[PDB]
Write an enzyme that holds these catalytic residues in place. Sequence first.
Site, mmCIF file in Angstrom:
data_model
loop_
_atom_site.group_PDB
_atom_site.id
_atom_site.type_symbol
_atom_site.label_atom_id
_atom_site.label_comp_id
_atom_site.label_asym_id
_atom_site.label_seq_id
_atom_site.Cartn_x
_atom_site.Cartn_y
_atom_site.Cartn_z
ATOM 1 N N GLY A 24 0.812 -1.215 0.000
ATOM 2 C CA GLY A 24 0.000 0.000 0.000
ATOM 3 C C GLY A 24 0.845 1.263 0.000
ATOM 4 N N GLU A 25 0.380 2.282 -0.726
ATOM 5 C CA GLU A 25 1.083 3.562 -0.843
ATOM 6 C C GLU A 25 0.119 4.737 -0.673
ATOM 7 O OE1 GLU A 25 3.345 3.397 -4.605
ATOM 8 O OE2 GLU A 25 5.061 2.852 -3.355
ATOM 9 N N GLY A 26 0.081 5.301 0.535
ATOM 10 C CA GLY A 26 -0.717 6.494 0.820
ATOM 11 C C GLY A 26 -0.017 7.782 0.408
ATOM 12 N N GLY A 29 3.761 8.414 2.549
ATOM 13 C CA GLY A 29 4.125 7.224 3.341
ATOM 14 C C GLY A 29 3.569 5.939 2.752
ATOM 15 N N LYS A 53 6.076 -0.414 7.673
ATOM 16 C CA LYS A 53 5.597 0.939 7.382
ATOM 17 C C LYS A 53 6.770 1.909 7.361
ATOM 18 C CE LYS A 53 1.749 2.365 9.157
ATOM 19 N NZ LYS A 53 0.560 2.740 9.967
ATOM 20 N N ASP A 158 -14.930 5.908 13.801
ATOM 21 C CA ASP A 158 -15.743 4.770 13.362
ATOM 22 C C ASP A 158 -14.935 3.477 13.218
ATOM 23 O OD1 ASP A 158 -14.407 5.533 10.785
ATOM 24 O OD2 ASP A 158 -15.759 4.015 9.973
ATOM 25 N N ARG A 162 -13.475 -2.694 6.283
ATOM 26 C CA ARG A 162 -12.215 -2.317 5.623
ATOM 27 C C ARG A 162 -11.064 -2.061 6.619
ATOM 28 N NH1 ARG A 162 -9.926 2.253 4.859
ATOM 29 N NH2 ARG A 162 -10.692 4.172 5.866
ATOM 30 N N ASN A 163 -11.395 -1.642 7.843
ATOM 31 C CA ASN A 163 -10.399 -1.451 8.917
ATOM 32 C C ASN A 163 -9.915 -2.747 9.583
ATOM 33 O OD1 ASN A 163 -10.871 1.305 8.480
ATOM 34 N ND2 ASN A 163 -12.216 1.517 10.275
ATOM 35 N N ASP A 176 -6.811 -0.190 12.569
ATOM 36 C CA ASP A 176 -6.885 1.201 13.022
ATOM 37 C C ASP A 176 -7.122 1.218 14.536
ATOM 38 O OD1 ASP A 176 -7.499 3.971 13.391
ATOM 39 O OD2 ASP A 176 -8.523 4.093 11.465
#
Length: 292
Positions: A24-26, A29, A53, A158, A162-163, A176
Amino acid sequence: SLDLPLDPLWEFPRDRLVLGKPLGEGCFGQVVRAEAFGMDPARPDQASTVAVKMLKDNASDKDLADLVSEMEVMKLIGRHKNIINLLGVCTQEGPLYVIVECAAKGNLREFLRARRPPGPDLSPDGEGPLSFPVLVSCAYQVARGMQYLESRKCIHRDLAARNVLVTEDNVMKIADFGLARGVHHIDYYLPVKWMAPEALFDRVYTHQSDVWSFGILLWEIFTLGGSPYPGIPVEELFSLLREGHRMDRPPHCPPELYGLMRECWHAAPSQRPTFKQLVEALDKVLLAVSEE
């Protein structure tokens, strides 16, 4: 100015993790897959897959501050089976790597949606990869994970499917942690339909608001990764909730579980069940399934 102390409980060497295979690439970061050797010191030459990370090339002062504090609060929270756990950190001989657990089966929504049957069942209501016990297990594991997180003073806006991430052995890891000790969980990869009314409008995020969201997560599980409030635009969802509207019972969901969903969605926060009670209720179902 990366001069963190060498925390002997958490410092792991550079030489010992082999990077690649980006997950994953946000913004600013990214999380990459890596093989780590002897992440269990009891098996010091034995290898294992992990998730690393790190900051991107476009580095920032504040983002390195966030990633450090995130990593610090993770070890403050402690380990639990049903959360993505901290494994190690690489601080001294290079840029910041935060080593965390890898979930081979992706997020819970993706996991559920990929394992869907090709259409409708033989009957409208009432053994394969998404067995009823498997779905009850998924719900239970997340409840345990949240129960832990709340005991560690973690608040979320919330919680959604997906979390939650799923491992090779179908263990549910909540990804999360949220806000804890004034530091947020940064995601290197608003959800109005998941948020409880007080969170949407008064911006009051409590344990009771997490339960509401868990109700929506349950409904997600038992619809095999369904989109909540189908056919309702996000605008004027709130009006429906104000009037008393709630989601219907999914096609293949026992009234016992629907009971829990409706209990999670009580308007008054005090009328909603605690995660202690949700765990009691889900374990009773799990037990009921294993019987006869």
